[PDB]
């Protein structure tokens, strides 16, 4: 899908920060709840990461639940040029 580089980067940054993203299955929603981008871009960005193994998706009650995988952490680290050290929120003492 054709997507602005800015919006794509915002989604990748969010996903790396939190390690999870929750998107309602609404392609017409003008703005995503947690990210300043169109909800369509979130769903289609993460669909492209899931097809490559980088993100695991679960779908329930018209919501997509995305969880970042180990391979996805590495990919996003390279893509964002982040310098080992900085992990995602899912490595900060999870417990739930």
């Amino acid at each position: 899908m054709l997507m602005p580089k800015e919006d794509r980067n915002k989604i990748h940054q969010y996903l790396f920060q939190e390690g999870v993203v929750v998107a309602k299955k609404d392609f017409n929603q003008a703005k995503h709840e947690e990210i300043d981008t169109k909800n369509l871009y979130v769903i289609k960005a993460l669909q492209s990461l899931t097809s490559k193994g980088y993100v695991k998706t679960q779908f329930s009650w018209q919501y997509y639940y995305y969880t970042l995988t180990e391979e996805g952490v590495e990919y996003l680290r390279e893509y964002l040029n982040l310098p080992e050290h900085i992990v995602p929120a899912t490595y900060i003492q999870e417990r739930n």
């Binding site: 639940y65 999870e94 739930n96």
Partner: protein, 220 residues
């Protein structure tokens, strides 16, 4: 918000969670969930069999759930706190057995071995009765419904709600979809809470053997 609306919304919150974890914690052997609403926090307890690798890695792939929970339902980080908990009586959990049936049927243990396998595992561990029904396509085109009953179980009345634990799962495969039905009666003697018998079960105590005749034989 009204109380009529609020308690219903807490019902739908539970129901959304139960269905979420069912498909998320499929491999990790999810029994169920309970929630305890306090003023500050909201406690949650994921009961599960495989409680080792649900947690793991000093937490690396676990709170994904809570971050997913806090994200959707609009909770702060400090409020909601889940817990992993070792499930008690793996046999009597009807959900666990129908889930275990799936994994046996996936790696290709044949129906009768799988069914009799699970029935005997239940019936050993304290269970007054059991049932397993498997329905659907299995290699033949026409579909059929085999039953694998053992022991004793009632069917009608309020005791069903009390004792017997129903659970169902849908299992995917090359040819069609097959469907499982694990009733497990549990013994009223091992109650914990509630009544300790069936309503029909009358019990009589035997009288002590009293000696006839006797004398006055007074005391002071």
């Amino acid at each position: 918000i009204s109380k009529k609306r609020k308690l219903v919304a807490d019902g739908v919150f539970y129901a959304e969670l139960n269905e979420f974890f069912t498909r998320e914690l499929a491999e990790e052997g999810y029994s169920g969930v309970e929630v305890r609403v306090t003023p500050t926090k909201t406690e949650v307890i994921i009961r599960a069999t495989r409680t080792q690798d649900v947690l793991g890695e000093n937490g690396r792939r676990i709170n994904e759930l809570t971050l997913l929970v806090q994200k959707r339902f609009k909770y702060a980080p400090g409020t909601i706190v889940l817990y992993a908990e070792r499930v008690q009586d793996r046999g009597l959990s009807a959900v666990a057995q129908a889930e275990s049936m799936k994994f046996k049927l996936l790696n290709g243990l044949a129906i009768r071995r799988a069914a009799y396998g699970v029935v005997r595992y239940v019936m050993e561990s304290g269970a007054k009765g059991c049932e397993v029904v498997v329905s659907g396509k299995l290699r033949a085109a026409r579909a059929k419904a085999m039953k694998f009953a053992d022991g004793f179980l009632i069917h009608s009345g309020q005791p069903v709600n009390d004792f017997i634990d129903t659970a169902t799962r849908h299992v995917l495969m090359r040819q069609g979809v097959l469907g499982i039905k694990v009733k497990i009666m549990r013994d009223p003697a091992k109650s914990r809470t509630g009544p300790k018998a069936l309503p029909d079960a009358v019990t009589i105590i035997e009288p002590k053997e009293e000696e006839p005749i006797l004398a006055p034989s007074v005391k002071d």
